[PDB]
Structures are given as structure tokens and as C-alpha cells.
Amino acid sequence: GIGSQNPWDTAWLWD
Prior knowledge:
The protein has no helices and no strands. The protein is globular. Helix content is 0%, strand content 0%. The PDB classes it as unknown function. Keywords: lassopeptide, chlorolassin, unknown function.
């Protein structure tokens, strides 16, 4: 994601 809760994905966390 870009700032969800899961581990850092595209940007922040994994939405």
C-alpha cells in the first residue's frame, strides 16, 4: 500500500 497497517508495501505498510 502507501500507509496502511500491514508490512511496508508500495510505500508504507500493506494496504
